[PDB]
Design an enzyme around this catalytic site. Structure first.
Site, PDB file in Angstrom:
ATOM      1  N   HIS A  61       0.817  -1.216   0.000  1.00 22.60           N
ATOM      2  CA  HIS A  61       0.000   0.000   0.000  1.00 22.60           C
ATOM      3  C   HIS A  61       0.844   1.255   0.000  1.00 22.60           C
ATOM      4  O   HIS A  61       0.400   2.272  -0.548  1.00 22.60           O
ATOM      5  CB  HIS A  61      -1.012   0.048   1.178  1.00 22.60           C
ATOM      6  CG  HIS A  61      -1.703  -1.272   1.415  1.00 22.60           C
ATOM      7  ND1 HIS A  61      -2.808  -1.697   0.696  1.00 22.60           N
ATOM      8  CD2 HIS A  61      -1.465  -2.230   2.336  1.00 22.60           C
ATOM      9  CE1 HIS A  61      -3.183  -2.892   1.129  1.00 22.60           C
ATOM     10  NE2 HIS A  61      -2.373  -3.245   2.114  1.00 22.60           N
ATOM     11  N   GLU A 103      -3.520  13.459   1.250  1.00 21.22           N
ATOM     12  CA  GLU A 103      -4.748  12.989   1.885  1.00 21.22           C
ATOM     13  C   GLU A 103      -5.497  14.179   2.484  1.00 21.22           C
ATOM     14  O   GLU A 103      -6.653  14.426   2.130  1.00 21.22           O
ATOM     15  CB  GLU A 103      -4.389  11.940   2.946  1.00 21.22           C
ATOM     16  CG  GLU A 103      -3.709  10.705   2.338  1.00 21.22           C
ATOM     17  CD  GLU A 103      -3.971   9.434   3.089  1.00 21.22           C
ATOM     18  OE1 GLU A 103      -3.624   9.396   4.278  1.00 21.22           O
ATOM     19  OE2 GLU A 103      -4.528   8.472   2.508  1.00 21.22           O
ATOM     20  N   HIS A 116       3.654  11.019   6.492  1.00 17.16           N
ATOM     21  CA  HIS A 116       3.067  10.710   7.797  1.00 17.16           C
ATOM     22  C   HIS A 116       4.131  10.097   8.690  1.00 17.16           C
ATOM     23  O   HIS A 116       4.610   8.995   8.401  1.00 17.16           O
ATOM     24  CB  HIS A 116       1.892   9.748   7.630  1.00 17.16           C
ATOM     25  CG  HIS A 116       0.713  10.399   6.990  1.00 17.16           C
ATOM     26  ND1 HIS A 116      -0.333   9.706   6.431  1.00 17.16           N
ATOM     27  CD2 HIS A 116       0.440  11.702   6.796  1.00 17.16           C
ATOM     28  CE1 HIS A 116      -1.220  10.549   5.958  1.00 17.16           C
ATOM     29  NE2 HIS A 116      -0.770  11.771   6.152  1.00 17.16           N
TER      30      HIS A 116
HETATM   31  C1  LIG Z   1       6.558  -2.124  11.674  1.00 17.50           C
HETATM   32  O1  LIG Z   1       5.885  -0.894  11.841  1.00 17.50           O
HETATM   33  C2  LIG Z   1       4.539  -1.047  12.221  1.00 17.50           C
HETATM   34  C3  LIG Z   1       4.160  -2.073  13.086  1.00 17.50           C
HETATM   35  C4  LIG Z   1       2.823  -2.202  13.442  1.00 17.50           C
HETATM   36  C5  LIG Z   1       1.884  -1.310  12.921  1.00 17.50           C
HETATM   37  C6  LIG Z   1       2.265  -0.282  12.057  1.00 17.50           C
HETATM   38  N1  LIG Z   1       1.310   0.690  11.505  1.00 17.50           N
HETATM   39  C7  LIG Z   1      -0.066   0.288  11.255  1.00 17.50           C
HETATM   40  O2  LIG Z   1      -0.462  -0.831  11.493  1.00 17.50           O
HETATM   41  N2  LIG Z   1      -1.072   1.164  10.715  1.00 17.50           N
HETATM   42  C8  LIG Z   1      -1.113   2.558  10.307  1.00 17.50           C
HETATM   43  C9  LIG Z   1      -0.327   3.602  10.764  1.00 17.50           C
HETATM   44  C10 LIG Z   1      -0.583   4.895  10.297  1.00 17.50           C
HETATM   45  C11 LIG Z   1      -1.588   5.114   9.337  1.00 17.50           C
HETATM   46  S1  LIG Z   1      -1.920   6.761   8.679  1.00 17.50           S
HETATM   47  N3  LIG Z   1      -1.938   6.659   6.998  1.00 17.50           N
HETATM   48  O3  LIG Z   1      -3.247   7.221   9.162  1.00 17.50           O
HETATM   49  O4  LIG Z   1      -0.765   7.605   9.115  1.00 17.50           O
HETATM   50  C12 LIG Z   1      -2.369   4.062   8.918  1.00 17.50           C
HETATM   51  C13 LIG Z   1      -2.119   2.789   9.403  1.00 17.50           C
HETATM   52  C14 LIG Z   1       3.598  -0.161  11.716  1.00 17.50           C
HETATM   53 ZN   LIG Z   2      -0.529   7.605   6.086  1.00 18.36          ZN
END
Ligand SMILES: COc1cccc(NC(=O)Nc2ccc(S(N)(=O)=O)cc2)c1
Ligand SMILES: [Zn+2]
Length: 257
Positions: A61, A103, A116
């Site tokens: 993604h 976004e 981000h």
């Molecule tokens: C290894 O690093 C990791 C480990 C575990 C989880 C994550 N991050 C995650 O699961 N989701 C996430 C973060 C920010 C945004 S956002 N676009 O709103 O900033 C959207 C989804 C990263």
């Molecule tokens: Zn993001």
């Protein structure tokens, strides 16, 4: 599975993630004339001198630059926040063309991309627990416009060839995220959500007013990445952004007059 195509993109996400139609979803349009200066807001504290990057990953993604968050090294404090939030990763969202990709929007203006920097509230002990709390995360959003090159981004751009496809990772140590910040830390802030599934409503959004400039050549290399895995039909990683969502019962606050 969810993505950004016509059959699985943001208009479809609510079927597997009903919170997509919730009361504090992100991103939003920032109407600069309606955002109120809040003199009680503090200056942001960005303490990245001891940041320890480890790895860069194409997750299908976006690509994430991941940090060692097992100690209080790189932290975000102050601003609208109570307590200490630890940097865990950063990533970008970007367009197929320079006229779209961010976004958040500013008076309906779309930027070429958006950075981000994701942080979690240390009072909850781990990231997985933090995302279950309304004040679990703080995401610092920085707009990108196309113009002069950003020298501090080039080390990211040059490794993307090695993580072209979904599931590929590469060692990425000693990267300094201070090289991605603009001069000013003036910001807007509002309560919102993750902008990808699972769309959890756990984020204090802090969006900087000052964009950074990157070069056309830099963002062109973002657009050579792939959503697909190795040995699958090539689908370029472009337009991986969620459009603006309804503001509903929320106020956007400005740190600046
Ligand atoms: C290894 O690093 C990791 C480990 C575990 C989880 C994550 N991050 C995650 O699961 N989701 C996430 C973060 C920010 C945004 S956002 N676009 O709103 O900033 C959207 C989804 C990263
Ligand atoms: Zn993001």
């Amino acid at each position: 599975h969810w993505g950004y195509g016509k059959h699985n993109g943001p208009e479809h996400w609510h079927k597997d993630f009903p919170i997509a139609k919730g009361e504090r979803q992100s991103p939003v349009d920032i109407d600069t004339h309606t955002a109120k200066y809040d003199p009680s807001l503090k200056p942001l504290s960005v303490s990245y001198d001891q940041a320890t990057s480890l790895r860069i990953l194409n997750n299908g993604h976006a690509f994430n630059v991941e940090f060692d968050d097992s100690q209080d090294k790189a932290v975000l404090k102050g601003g609208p926040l109570d307590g200490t939030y630890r940097l865990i990763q950063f990533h970008f969202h970007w367009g197929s063309l320079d006229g779209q990709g961010s976004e958040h929007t500013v008076d309906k203006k779309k930027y070429a991309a958006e950075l981000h920097l994701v942080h979690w509230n240390t009072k909850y002990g781990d990231f997985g627990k933090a995302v279950q709390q309304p004040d679990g995360l703080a995401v610092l959003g920085i707009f990108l416009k196309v113009g002069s090159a950003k020298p501090g981004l080039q080390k990211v751009v040059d490794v993307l060839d090695s993580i072209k496809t979904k599931g590929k990772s590469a060692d990425f140590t000693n990267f300094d995220p201070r090289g991605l910040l603009p001069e000013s830390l003036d910001y807007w802030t509002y309560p919102g959500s993750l902008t990808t599934p699972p769309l959890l409503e756990c984020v204090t959004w802090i969006v900087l007013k000052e964009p950074i400039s990157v070069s056309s050549e830099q963002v062109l290399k973002f657009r050579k990445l792939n959503f697909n895995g190795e040995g699958e039909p090539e689908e370029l990683m472009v337009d991986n952004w969620r459009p603006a969502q309804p503001l509903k019962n929320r106020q956007i606050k400005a740190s600046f007059k």
